Amino acid sequence: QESVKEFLAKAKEEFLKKWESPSQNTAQLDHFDRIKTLGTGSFGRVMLVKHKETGNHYAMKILDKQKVVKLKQIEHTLNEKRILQAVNFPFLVKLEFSFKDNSNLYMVMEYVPGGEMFSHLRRIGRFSEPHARFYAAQIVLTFEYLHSLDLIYRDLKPENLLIDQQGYIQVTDFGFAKRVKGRTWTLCGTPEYLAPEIILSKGYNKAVDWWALGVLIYEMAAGYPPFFADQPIQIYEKIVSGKVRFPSHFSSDLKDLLRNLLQVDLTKRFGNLKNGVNDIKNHKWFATTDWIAIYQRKVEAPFIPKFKGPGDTSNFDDYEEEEIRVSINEKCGKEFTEF
Numbered sequence: 283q284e285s286v287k288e289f290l291a292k293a294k295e296e297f298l299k300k301w302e303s304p305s306q307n308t309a310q311l312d313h314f315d316r317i318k319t320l321g322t323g324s325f326g327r328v329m330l331v332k333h334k335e336t337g338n339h340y341a342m343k344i345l346d347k348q349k350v351v352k353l354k355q356i357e358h359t360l361n362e363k364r365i366l367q368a369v370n371f372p373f374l375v376k377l378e379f380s381f382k383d384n385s386n387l388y389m390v391m392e393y394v395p396g397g398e399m400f401s402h403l404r405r406i407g408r409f410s411e412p413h414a415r416f417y418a419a420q421i422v423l424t425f426e427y428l429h430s431l432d433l434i435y436r437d438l439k440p441e442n443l444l445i446d447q448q449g450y451i452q453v454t455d456f457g458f459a460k461r462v463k464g465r466t467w468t469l470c471g472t473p474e475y476l477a478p479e480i481i482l483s484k485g486y487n488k489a490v491d492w493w494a495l496g497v498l499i500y501e502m503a504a505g506y507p508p509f510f511a512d513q514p515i516q517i518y519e520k521i522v523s524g525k526v527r528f529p530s531h532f533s534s535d536l537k538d539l540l541r542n543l544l545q546v547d548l549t550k551r552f553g554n555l556k557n558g559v560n561d562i563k564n565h566k567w568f569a570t571t572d573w574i575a576i577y578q579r580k581v582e583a584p585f586i587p588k589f590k591g592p593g594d595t596s597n598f599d600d601y602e603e604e605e606i607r608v609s610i611n612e613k614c615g616k617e618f619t620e621f
């Protein structure tokens with residue numbers, strides 16, 4: 283379709299210009315007031331902050347450089363910031379500022395108060411097929427965009443999808459995203475969502491994102507993921523078998539789409555065939571989806587998360603509040619020069 287082709291050509295042109303000349307050092311820490319910790323990880327945290335001059339709220343991801351190095355995440359953190367400052371799509375969280383100091387890397391992103399899809403899914407139990415399909419369509423369009431830029435996302439899971447004030451998805455956490463023109467090899471991603479070729483230590487490509495979409499759609503429509511087991515080793519055994527049991531309440535069209543996304547043979551997997559994303563967009567399960575209306579955010583969403591305003595944190599969890607300490611001495615300057 284000429285309009286999609288022209289859209290994606292322009293998208294790549296615009297991405298490449300920012301990719302080749304990344305923005306750097308566009309804010310500093312004392313421009314913000316810290317409000318609340320929204321999430322943690324082994325090498326950083328994400329805090330709700332408020333800009334002191336504008337009053338705008340943001341989600342500030344703070345990465346400890348020394349822990350990034352120790353956990354062998356240097357390239358991944360450089361990927362994350364370089365990609366985020368270069369992309370632009372309705373369903374991707376926007377990076378507004380980035381900077382670094384003696385101790386930390388900072389990515390200041392839009393704050394989405396509706397919370398993670400994970401929370402809403404666990405609260406409701408499962409989404410109806412129309413509700414799952416609305417979110418899935420946004421992921422399909424997002425992956426069509428990312429993959430056209432030679433980007434692999436590699437962290438699709440319900441925790442990484444925020445629900446915004448219109449009830450639409452915003453994909454967050456580009457910590458594993460990478461520009462890859464052929465194959466890549468790193469073991470990363472959450473066990474339940476890993477494609478077989480990742481588990482088997484193969485060179486893999488964008489087809490792993492389409493596998494993860496199959497896992498996501500299954501989990502949204504069932505309320506639990508298809509390869510569920512108590513420990514990762516047992517999850518991995520189920521994944522590589524690819525034996526999947528579908529709830530009888532799944533429609534036949536849903537089952538057919540899922541068998542083609544959860545195809546162990548990556549050379550047969552939807553999204554990775556000659557017709558690319560169009561095998562997904564044209565599948566019967568998506569027959570009711572108006573792809574353009576989704577892109578233009580003209581479809582009424584299945585629900586609007588309850589929240590009081592742009593500063594409300596009620597849809598996020600409570601964490602111990604720790605210092606944001608900045609050393610008097612620069613750490614790991616060399617490793618993060620390009621950030």
Ligand SMILES: COC(=O)c1coc([C@H](CO)NC2CCOCC2)n1
Pocket residue numbers: 320321322323324325326327328341343394441442454455598
């Ligand atoms: C270092 O730890 C993180 O950066 C982190 C941990 O948990 C999360 C979640 C889901 O991954 N995403 C944010 C995105 C912005 O709004 C709150 C949640 N991020």
